[PDB]
Amino acid sequence: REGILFTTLEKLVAWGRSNSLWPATFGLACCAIEMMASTDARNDLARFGSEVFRASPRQADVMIVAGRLSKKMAPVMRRVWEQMPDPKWVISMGACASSGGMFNNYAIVQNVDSVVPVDVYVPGCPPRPEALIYAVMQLQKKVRGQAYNERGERLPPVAAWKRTRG
Amino acid sequence: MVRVGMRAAPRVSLEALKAALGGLKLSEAKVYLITDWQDKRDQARYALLLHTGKKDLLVPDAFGPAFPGGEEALSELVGLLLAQGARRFYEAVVSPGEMTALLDLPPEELLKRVMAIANPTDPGIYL
Amino acid sequence: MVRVKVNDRIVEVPPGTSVMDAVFHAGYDVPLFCSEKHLSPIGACRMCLVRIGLPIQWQPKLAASCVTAVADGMVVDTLSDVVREAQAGMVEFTLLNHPLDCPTCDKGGACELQDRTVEYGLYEKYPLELPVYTRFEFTRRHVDKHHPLSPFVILDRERCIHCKRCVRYFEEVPGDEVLDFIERGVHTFIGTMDFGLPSGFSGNITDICPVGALLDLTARFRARNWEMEETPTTCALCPV
Amino acid sequence: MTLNVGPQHPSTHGVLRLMVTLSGEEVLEVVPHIGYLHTGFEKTMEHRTYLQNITYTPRMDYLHSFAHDLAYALAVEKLLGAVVPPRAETIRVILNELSRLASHLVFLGTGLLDLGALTPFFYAFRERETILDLFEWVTGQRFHHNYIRIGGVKEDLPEEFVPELKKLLEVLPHRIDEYEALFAESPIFYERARGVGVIPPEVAIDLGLTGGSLRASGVNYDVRKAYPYSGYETYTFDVPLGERGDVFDRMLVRIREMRESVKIIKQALERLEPGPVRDPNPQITPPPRHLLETSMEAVIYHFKHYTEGFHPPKGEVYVPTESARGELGYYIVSDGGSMPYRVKVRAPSFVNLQSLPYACKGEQVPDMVAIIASLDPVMGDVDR
Amino acid sequence: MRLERVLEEARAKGYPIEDNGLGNLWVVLPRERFKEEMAHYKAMGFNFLADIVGLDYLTYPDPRPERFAVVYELVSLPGWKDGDGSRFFVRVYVPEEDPRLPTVTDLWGSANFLEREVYDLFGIVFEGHPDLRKILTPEDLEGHPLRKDYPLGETPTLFREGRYIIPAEFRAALTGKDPGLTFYKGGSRKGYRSLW
Amino acid sequence: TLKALAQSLGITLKYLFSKPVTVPYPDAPVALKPRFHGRHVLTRHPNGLEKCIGCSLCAAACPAYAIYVEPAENDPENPVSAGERYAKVYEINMLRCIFCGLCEEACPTGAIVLGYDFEMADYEYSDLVYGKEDMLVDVVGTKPQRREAKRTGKPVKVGYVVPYVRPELEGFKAPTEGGK
Amino acid sequence: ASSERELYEAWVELLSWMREYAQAKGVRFEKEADFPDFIYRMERPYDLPTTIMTASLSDGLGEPFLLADVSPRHAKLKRIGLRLPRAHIHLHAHYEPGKGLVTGKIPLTKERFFALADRAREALAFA
Ligand code: SF4
Ligand code: SF4
Ligand code: SF4
Ligand code: SF4
Numbered sequence A: 001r002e003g004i005l006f007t008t009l010e011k012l013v014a015w016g017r018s019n020s021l022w023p024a025t026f027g028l029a030c031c032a033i034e035m036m037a038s039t040d041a042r043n044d045l046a047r048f049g050s051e052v053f054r055a056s057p058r059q060a061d062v063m064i065v066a067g068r069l070s071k072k073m074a075p076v077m078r079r080v081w082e083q084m085p086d087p088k089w090v091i092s093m094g095a096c097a098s099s100g101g102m103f104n105n106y107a108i109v110q111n112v113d114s115v116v117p118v119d120v121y122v123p124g125c126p127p128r129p130e131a132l133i134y135a136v137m138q139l140q141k142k143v144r145g146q147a148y149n150e151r152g153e154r155l156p157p158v159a160a161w162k163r164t165r166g
Numbered sequence B: 001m002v003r004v005g006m007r008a009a010p011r012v013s014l015e016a017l018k019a020a021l022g023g024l025k026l027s028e029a030k031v032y033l034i035t036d037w038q039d040k041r042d043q044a045r046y047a048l049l050l051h052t053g054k055k056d057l058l059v060p061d062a063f064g065p066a067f068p069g070g071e072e073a074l075s076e077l078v079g080l081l082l083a084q085g086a087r088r089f090y091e092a093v094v095s096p097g098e099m100t101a102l103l104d105l106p107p108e109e110l111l112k113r114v115m116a117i118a119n120p121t122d123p124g125i126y127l
Numbered sequence C: 001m002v003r004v005k006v007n008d009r010i011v012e013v014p015p016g017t018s019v020m021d022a023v024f025h026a027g028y029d030v031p032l033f034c035s036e037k038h039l040s041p042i043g044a045c046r047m048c049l050v051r052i053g054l055p056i057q058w059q060p061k062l063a064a065s066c067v068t069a070v071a072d073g074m075v076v077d078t079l080s081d082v083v084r085e086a087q088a089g090m091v092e093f094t095l096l097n098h099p100l101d102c103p104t105c106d107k108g109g110a111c112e113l114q115d116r117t118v119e120y121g122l123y124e125k126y127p128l129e130l131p132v133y134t135r136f137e138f139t140r141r142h143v144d145k146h147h148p149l150s151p152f153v154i155l156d157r158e159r160c161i162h163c164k165r166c167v168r169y170f171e172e173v174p175g176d177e178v179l180d181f182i183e184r185g186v187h188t189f190i191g192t193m194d195f196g197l198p199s200g201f202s203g204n205i206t207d208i209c210p211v212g213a214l215l216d217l218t219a220r221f222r223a224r225n226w227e228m229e230e231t232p233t234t235c236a237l238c239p240v
Numbered sequence D: 001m002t003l004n005v006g007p008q009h010p011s012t013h014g015v016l017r018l019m020v021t022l023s024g025e026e027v028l029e030v031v032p033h034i035g036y037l038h039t040g041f042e043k044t045m046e047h048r049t050y051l052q053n054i055t056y057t058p059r060m061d062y063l064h065s066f067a068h069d070l071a072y073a074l075a076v077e078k079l080l081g082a083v084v085p086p087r088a089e090t091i092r093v094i095l096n097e098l099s100r101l102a103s104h105l106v107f108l109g110t111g112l113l114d115l116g117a118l119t120p121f122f123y124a125f126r127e128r129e130t131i132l133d134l135f136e137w138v139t140g141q142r143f144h145h146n147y148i149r150i151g152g153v154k155e156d157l158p159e160e161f162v163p164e165l166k167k168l169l170e171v172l173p174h175r176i177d178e179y180e181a182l183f184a185e186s187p188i189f190y191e192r193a194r195g196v197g198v199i200p201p202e203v204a205i206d207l208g209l210t211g212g213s214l215r216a217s218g219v220n221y222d223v224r225k226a227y228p229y230s231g232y233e234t235y236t237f238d239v240p241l242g243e244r245g246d247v248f249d250r251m252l253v254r255i256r257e258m259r260e261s262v263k264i265i266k267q268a269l270e271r272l273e274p275g276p277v278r279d280p281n282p283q284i285t286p287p288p289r290h291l292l293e294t295s296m297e298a299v300i301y302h303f304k305h306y307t308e309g310f311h312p313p314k315g316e317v318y319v320p321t322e323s324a325r326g327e328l329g330y331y332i333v334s335d336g337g338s339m340p341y342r343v344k345v346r347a348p349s350f351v352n353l354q355s356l357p358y359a360c361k362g363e364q365v366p367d368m369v370a371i372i373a374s375l376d377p378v379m380g381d382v383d384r
Numbered sequence E: 001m002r003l004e005r006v007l008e009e010a011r012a013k014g015y016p017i018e019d020n021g022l023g024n025l026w027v028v029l030p031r032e033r034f035k036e037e038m039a040h041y042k043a044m045g046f047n048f049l050a051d052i053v054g055l056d057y058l059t060y061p062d063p064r065p066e067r068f069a070v071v072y073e074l075v076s077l078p079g080w081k082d083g084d085g086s087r088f089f090v091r092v093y094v095p096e097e098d099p100r101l102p103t104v105t106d107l108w109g110s111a112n113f114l115e116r117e118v119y120d121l122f123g124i125v126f127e128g129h130p131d132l133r134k135i136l137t138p139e140d141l142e143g144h145p146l147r148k149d150y151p152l153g154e155t156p157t158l159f160r161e162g163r164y165i166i167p168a169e170f171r172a173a174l175t176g177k178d179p180g181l182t183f184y185k186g187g188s189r190k191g192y193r194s195l196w
Numbered sequence F: 001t002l003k004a005l006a007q008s009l010g011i012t013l014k015y016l017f018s019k020p021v022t023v024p025y026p027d028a029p030v031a032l033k034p035r036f037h038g039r040h041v042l043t044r045h046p047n048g049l050e051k052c053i054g055c056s057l058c059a060a061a062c063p064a065y066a067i068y069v070e071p072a073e074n075d076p077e078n079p080v081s082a083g084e085r086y087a088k089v090y091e092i093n094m095l096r097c098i099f100c101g102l103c104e105e106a107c108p109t110g111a112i113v114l115g116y117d118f119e120m121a122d123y124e125y126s127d128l129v130y131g132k133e134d135m136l137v138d139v140v141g142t143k144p145q146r147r148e149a150k151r152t153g154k155p156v157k158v159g160y161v162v163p164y165v166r167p168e169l170e171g172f173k174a175p176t177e178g179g180k
Numbered sequence G: 001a002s003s004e005r006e007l008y009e010a011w012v013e014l015l016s017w018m019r020e021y022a023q024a025k026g027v028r029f030e031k032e033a034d035f036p037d038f039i040y041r042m043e044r045p046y047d048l049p050t051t052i053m054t055a056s057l058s059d060g061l062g063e064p065f066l067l068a069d070v071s072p073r074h075a076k077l078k079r080i081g082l083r084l085p086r087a088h089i090h091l092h093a094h095y096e097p098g099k100g101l102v103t104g105k106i107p108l109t110k111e112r113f114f115a116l117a118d119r120a121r122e123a124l125a126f127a
């Protein structure tokens, strides 16, 4: 039941989800290869709980948009996201995903937050694999309720919990 | 191209668009929400361009929480677009100085500009 | 009309034409600092130098195309190796005493000195030779800097390249001689004993000055030339 | 079964859409659908300075990026008449062959994982990580490095680069020999790849399959020999080839290419003598940063160059090069302005894709993935 | 060796020969002779068809015959049966109101995707093509991007308190038709070339 | 080639018994090369005066147009830069920034120089537009790192170590190779 | 030779004298320009004691009556110069070891500079 309505139970389930964060990569460009580097035998996102990698979208809570999101790919990524189980989070990797990046033109979406509810942003071109790990710990402690913005506000555990999907 | 409503009149623009739309089927129409400042929607304003393919309909920047009742006006507007079967929703980002003159450009130029700059968007973010 | 030939091209041109205007009418280019539209050309920067033949009878020395009249069937050369070499040398002489303010200069991207420098200077001498930018290794002219001449105009006497544009204008167009040089030699500098800048047309010297000597006090340190958005419009303060 | 293998699913690397018209376990015909990565470089570049564009060149083929960098640099140098120092040329060939090794590593890892086993991906990626450490040492960036310049290279090498490069050049022969020992004597890979991937050279030519999968079918055409550009004319060079183009021969040809590239790197490092690093023409190269506090000409040129840039002559130009994916080149129309009039890129990954329905024609359904991985596609290059 | 015979054949029939001192060669055939001439070129042994590149000369400082110009690249592989290595371009101008040009897909199967791309980016329609379908631009995209009459479509860059940047008004670099920020551009900034 | 299955298994066993290779970030500080493109820093002169003279050359050289520079006139009583001009507002949108280094390359005063911090992932678009006072050499950490160290009371530890900092970074303090 | 260090020291000394005369007489002093070799030095070292190259004494109207300048760190034939604007008056001071700051052969004392500045003020100053 969303992991709510008991002081101990919700912290326990958030602990569980935070460490069991299941990445589903949505590789678009070179951000995707720099994310593939976050899994090799120098710096692996295979310790915190992200060892397994199920290509199916029915099986992962974290959606990592890694690369430039072309406007022709926007509905596809939209429906891949909608076709995810509900306790789901969105990471936006790299400049092309976060903003329009250096490609400010008709072809690329200027903020992936337009199509999918983004949870974490991670700048860089490409963002270093260790910056991506910083982002996943950021999201970890976010779903732990340990995340605050520059304005002082605590951030909700799950974005895409706040939208009128339709 | 038709221009209905007036700037900073959310409910007047909403009612004028309610009347002017009629029973028009929006299955192949494209709804362009023109706004500035991608990130901050709490003080954002919105204009609308409805590209049916056979004719276009313009509403000036009169929606959004920037105006009293403009947030609920934008929610009702997008809800009505979705109810009429609109699926292709886009968000266009123009400069504040542009937003005024952009609605005074000729129809072909304004529409070509909007279609070039529009980003596919989840209509839910306006609900 | 008068028949002119610029380096490969033939031009009809009215008789009272300047050689410089015949050059540009042919589509060529030549440095330009002292002369200005609607102002009397007088060879001061000596930048508009070209070659002229009137026969093959080349003139002995280079003609200042800004103050040289045109004759029927006249040849004008702007591409000669010697012509471009002299252009680069004059650019160096002009850059001799300049204060090194380009990054912090309010004149920014649109500085005639900058642009004619990058256009015509550093002629190709003849390999991967290591070339020198500046030969002058002595102390540059240092004079009064950033002096408000009026609530609207600021004066950098170091950036002045001692063209005649501002005093020429002040004498000719408004008819208010409220600006002139004081000393001579290299000690020449712009000054006035009429300090308020009485003329109601003083602000145009800011547009005329090819350097950042005369700048707009009301817009000082706001943005760089390229950064600003230009809206061309008409002024509705009076019916002209 | 007109089956829709969607974009990114299931695990079709290089996001692509496929309409596999297919009954059974064969492959009747694959209808490819691309455009999901189209960014618009050919238009965006018209509104960027020539110096600015050096940030745009690596980002299309992001595996072998320095080939893009080199092709663009060379075309501009031809157009405006620039002189490249010999040491800068040697550094450029070293970086190009190093990014070639990195791209070859990633290609073979992706193929083996795509069909086959997961394990051999990690060794190739460890060697790639050593290469990326070299790239960080020199340029401060892993890839998309903004190091090449129109005159030459941005700056010189640190002291620590040559020792680490010798370390890698000593470990690499054994490593590449290990990959060959695992693969060439293929236990199952043989019965998986030897037959599949029909590549008749005539159809490869008619459809224009130039990109390194052509020599696996027995065509001896390499640009580094046919049209030497960066001084490869002066290198002892073996060009690997294949008998009949299949996945097996493709992969083994690329492995021999990696060893030959290592030998080229050793040779170039041996012929390396100190010197200058870029064309001192100030219209092309920004003034040295040390005298920016002394010369008015330096300051003016620095300011003008870093704001407006420079203006090449009016004309069109093109230069061909050989990347780890085939023939690459830039057709540049310059109008005498500070930004190029138009830049069109010949995409080898794009022209190679016309032979996919033919290549995987009649092949197996599991092998439709292996035959795609073996063709070495990059959708950043294809869609562009 | 086959290139010498191409130049000799083009010069005799009044085909212009454009050459830069850098080593690049064009042979511009008229619209009529385009198809049959390049068929003859393939017959001469031009194995490989490298590129089909479309050009919009609308914003070019000097005028051109027609707005659009398509350039093909023909090659003969050196390491094949009898490889000379002769490679060259064929340029063909195309009217604004007649975006037609015969395909060479029947000749080279390489031209298939390239001509589809040129149709996608410019309104240039290729006659006799097996399938002229939009390749790269989104299915719902209206128009042809790379012809200069089509906007690049930039989005402003965003900062803290009302501070934004419009790149088209922020750019300091100039195009060929851009006058510059001074009264004019001459010298290097009207075109510059060093003498090697 | 039946032998190959056995040889493959054997080499995989050898590498199994080869234990070491990995680095455990954040538990082990990542080794970065000295030229790495990290968080922008504005540098100061020995006088303490800022180097930045607000010349917008870093913004003009920006291919992503991520640098906003509002200039102002130095105050003789309490100066900021070395000339008559300094950086009144210096903002860089890290989400627009593509990390060239062209801004530093156009920097005539050596004010703007790329740093070494990479732990700058954050939650909000509007928080990733870094300001001047988030980039000065005096600051130690990234925005989320500092915010965590303040809402935590636990000092900032950077996840990187380098052999040394470049001279252009003069003043930039970092953990160096074990010098500390 | 090594005279440079004491030259810049005496340059700082003369600047101190100018500041003192300004404060005493209630007349404007201005730092006109700093060293380009200190502005544009990015990482490069700066050993000079001060970064100031040009200064001036301006009257109430802001027009200077006295100008003083020093040669940059890297220029040939290093000197210190003085100028009376509008008076065609120029002075060239060097530094002789043991003696001190001298205009040619004549010692340049603080009293000498004060008398020169007072005369310049009374004559040239407009207000
Ligand atoms: S942000 Fe840089 S690395 Fe990531 S997809 Fe864009 S170009 Fe590639
Ligand atoms: S006047 Fe021109 S050349 Fe002199 S500092 Fe200003 S921009 Fe530079
Ligand atoms: S102040 Fe300017 S316009 Fe007047 S003479 Fe000097 S350079 Fe020419
Ligand atoms: S590093 Fe960032 S701020 Fe600097 S020029 Fe590049 S994109 Fe612009």
Ligand code: SF4
Binding pocket: C103, F051, F052, F053, F054, F055, F056, F057, F058, F059, F069, F087, F103, F106, F107, F108, F109, F110, F111, F112
């Ligand atoms: S280029 Fe350097 S000195 Fe100029 S504004 Fe940028 S950081 Fe400051």
Ligand code: FES
Binding pocket: C031, C032, C033, C034, C035, C041, C042, C043, C044, C045, C046, C047, C048, C049, C064, C065, C066, C067
């Ligand atoms: S332009 Fe003729 S001399 Fe100044």
